[PDB]
Design a protein around this ligand. Sequence first.
Ligand code: FAD
Ligand code: FAD
Ligand code: CL
Ligand code: CL
Lengths: 525, 525
Amino acid sequence: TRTLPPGVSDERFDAALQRFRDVVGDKWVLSTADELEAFRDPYPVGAAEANLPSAVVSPESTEQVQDIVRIANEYGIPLHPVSTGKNNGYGGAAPRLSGSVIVKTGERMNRILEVNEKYGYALLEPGVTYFDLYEYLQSHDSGLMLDCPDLGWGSVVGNTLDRGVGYTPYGDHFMWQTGLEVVLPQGEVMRTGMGALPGSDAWQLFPYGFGPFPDGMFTQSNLGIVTKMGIALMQRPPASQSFLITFDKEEDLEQIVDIMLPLRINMAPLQNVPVLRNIFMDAAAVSKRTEWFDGDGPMPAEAIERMKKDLDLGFWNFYGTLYGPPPLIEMYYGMIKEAFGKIPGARFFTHEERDDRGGHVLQDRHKINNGIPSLDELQLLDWVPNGGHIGFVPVSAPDGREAMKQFEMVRNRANEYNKDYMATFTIGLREMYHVCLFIYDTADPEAREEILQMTKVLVREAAEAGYGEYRTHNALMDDVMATFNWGDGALLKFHEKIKDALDPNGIIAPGKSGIWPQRFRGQNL
Amino acid sequence: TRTLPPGVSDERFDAALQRFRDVVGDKWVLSTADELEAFRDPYPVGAAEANLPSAVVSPESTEQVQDIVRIANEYGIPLHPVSTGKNNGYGGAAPRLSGSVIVKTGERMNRILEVNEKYGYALLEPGVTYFDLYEYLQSHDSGLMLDCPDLGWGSVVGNTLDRGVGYTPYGDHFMWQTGLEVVLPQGEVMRTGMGALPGSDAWQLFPYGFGPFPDGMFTQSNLGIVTKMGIALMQRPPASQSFLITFDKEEDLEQIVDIMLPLRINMAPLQNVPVLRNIFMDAAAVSKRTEWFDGDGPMPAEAIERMKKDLDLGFWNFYGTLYGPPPLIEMYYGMIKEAFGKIPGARFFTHEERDDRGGHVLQDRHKINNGIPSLDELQLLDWVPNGGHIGFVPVSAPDGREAMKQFEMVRNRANEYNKDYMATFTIGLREMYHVCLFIYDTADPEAREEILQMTKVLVREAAEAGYGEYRTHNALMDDVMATFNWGDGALLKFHEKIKDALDPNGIIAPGKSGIWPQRFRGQNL
Ligand SMILES: *Cc1cc2c(cc1C)nc1c(=O)[nH]c(=O)nc-1n2C[C@H](O)[C@H](O)[C@H](O)COP(=O)(O)OP(=O)(O)OC[C@H]1O[C@@H](n2cnc3c(N)ncnc32)[C@H](O)[C@@H]1O
Ligand SMILES: *Cc1cc2c(cc1C)nc1c(=O)[nH]c(=O)nc-1n2C[C@H](O)[C@H](O)[C@H](O)COP(=O)(O)OP(=O)(O)OC[C@H]1O[C@@H](n2cnc3c(N)ncnc32)[C@H](O)[C@@H]1O
Ligand SMILES: [Cl-]
Ligand SMILES: [Cl-]
């Protein structure tokens, strides 16, 4: 059946579509079933269809965004704004609320507005991808570098707006975001920070401006449609070196984390974001599951040992990058070798020593950690046929016993739902992430349903242990928000009040982060 | 005449005071004229009285804060929450709206709730001063250090909540703030971040939690009364060295700023916040104005030269601190000497090489930049009789020509009012602050009115040139917010909608940051 916005008739939707065409042009409104297939979640969760877009609208300008938002208010049409819509693992471009119209800002709002070499920043529209920005920097012989997530095809803006992350010293994208322009839910436009001061040259220099600081309220949010965003860009160091440390035993995790923290908290000698990937992650990056095991159920111990030996990797594989003059790199690498060398069985490899099959991940991290965008990690999805993933990422204290607890409890449930445990432990400065990716056959309804049910259990069990997630998929947003319920659900009640005040007609991305406007609240959508 | 809350009769206010006494205890409510004198602005602006408190209430707990807020909602009494109320330069403890009750959270909510050595943080109530936290760290032989503003007697929490700043690598207090507990305007209590996840140990480890990030909305804000706040603490480095660079000429500012930026933007070799103080700042720290000039009008050129020669200082005096092992400090100091040594007349001094009166400021900066709180800068107020100051701090790009423009325009305007130009230029990473202090005789109604009228002009002239202030005094909040008026005042309209949604009775700090609730809007208060 044709996908319609909730409460909106075929005829009223057709009227709204024509109003959108009048704003953006006929070819920039998509509403046929075949056209919309490409905007469904590529990695669907649950057997049942969910998260169905009713249309896609591609505006060319801020003023067009304002007009789209005004039309949506008049007709009661929910809008799901995206930049590039590559939020794969968390829903892709698909809306939380079925029937919503996707506003694909990045299709035509794709300009690099400014790159400032001296102060080190960019001012971007949503359609600038990491590859686009890297191409600009390279072609202009920039002394700046970007900070990219594992895949380069997403949006510098869109990624930041979901509090996405990379792995250089500038890996906290929201931290380095500086200034934004946003269309609020009834169509008015606002600039944050020094952008609110007409004529200021400091929109991308000083984030806070004057008065209450609002920019974080537009991340993981449904309070507007962002049209411009600034971000600081780090100067490229004179040299860099990447390294891999393999650790042979599953149980080494405890000691690895307990050494990682003191080496990272002062930003030296671990200068970049530490990443500790398990053998399943690294094998999936370079091989298919059937190279190792073609049977039913969890991978047996003998097959895991074959992965390790054939790829010359450990159960846990640490990747880091060092920056600066050669003497500084040498000093820091010596400190890291001395410290992690206390773990029996640790072995060390630099990016210049190892470029075999098993070292493909090291070479990829060397690119990523130097702001060179990549799509090599798409090979993960070849682990099984029709591969897709969901991301499950609890936050905790950077404590080795806490890490072991999380490793074991997540792997136990993964085994029970017939999913491989693919995980990375990372530390920011003082916090730990358990970055779990679950890869499955997206064409199998049973596997889809298992992913949904397993991850609901993982969310609950993590919360029972005092862990909450930093980001989640459409299918889990209500459940994750429900875990943040100190003080009888005070946080969500606060967000709801703000949502209803800014969005009285309940238009923007209803249900994002579990935050529903009044007209949809308590309706099991 | 007795100061009353707007619209509240003397009899109703007396009843409300008894209600407050029943919550906090009779001795913890102040309401006599003499009791309230200490809570008036110590450094008043304008000849006419303004910013008069009606009472002070000192709660002992979050629950008492909630009860106070509920009473205030019932009676329509505005509340001005403070921590220690030492916001001198910006109004002291005094409320923006005359007649408001000051809620002095820090008098009795003064506990250090946790200092965590391994992860490097503190969880604090509002009454913990920098001196208190320093005493704790020293007495427990901590390996951590704090980051303090110039004066140590304020609140780690209160300072952060006005986006105050210090001078170590952790000088951006809000950046390092991690988690808070707040009583919202109708008395509900909420925890931000991982504090919303019951049982999480990461409240002070991971700032953002899940969903829209709100904590910045409680800074320079009137959206609640904060009762707990976390902040990260840096590890103390193994050694440190401070230095002064004297620059002889007024016009050296251009070249100094243009060298400061490249040496700071990568956080090395300028590892701490660079501060470039003019001769008036450094003289005022150690001497009275009449030592140099007792006449009418601006300070003559001959007297400026006498200050320089007597103190062995420049017109512009750069102060910095280096940290790390001795060899690292030596390397960075050599880089700094090489770079700034390109300016003719530059002279260099370490903190071990100046024991003269002129070196007093270097000794003070060496304390502050090492997280050792001080009150030595109170001597600034002895520049003139009954001395007080107001702070005027525009934000701009870290460009030497922009610095010269700001220097000249501010000094020109100050000269019209016979007020000395006391300024510091600082850089964060990519932004510049023009930290102006105007010192005046607080007992002289003509001086008070000059300061008001001068600073209103300075705000306007700065905005005309594209500079906006990062923070301001009660007297200037309406004028400063009016400068951030891109998009026909879009920013303020947004803040107003949020204020009215969270504070329907218009209770919390009306007019803070120029943000007035509906009941007071457009009333010239
Ligand atoms: C499959 C996968 C994913 C992945 C990854 C590795 C694999 C194998 N590694 C990641 C990593 O290292 N870091 C990270 O942050 N993400 C990683 N991912 C996930 C994903 O690939 C990336 O995050 C990707 O960059 C996200 O997609 P994109 O950049 O296209 O962003 P988007 O879909 O457009 O927007 C995301 C959400 O943000 C809000 N949004 C976006 N634009 C707007 C505008 N203009 N206004 C308002 N809100 C906006 C929406 O909520 C949107 O859904
Ligand atoms: C005179 C002077 C001042 C000064 C300075 C040098 C001189 C000579 N150097 C400073 C510096 O280096 N850095 C800086 O940030 N400030 C500097 N100052 C100004 C002042 O001394 C300090 O900022 C001082 O620490 C501020 O006072 P305090 O720390 O006592 O903070 P407060 O008055 O209690 O609160 C300030 C405002 O914040 C909001 N607030 C505070 N507590 C709450 C709670 N609990 N809930 C909600 N809002 C709260 C209020 O708006 C309050 O007015
Ligand atoms: Cl609006
Ligand atoms: Cl409330």
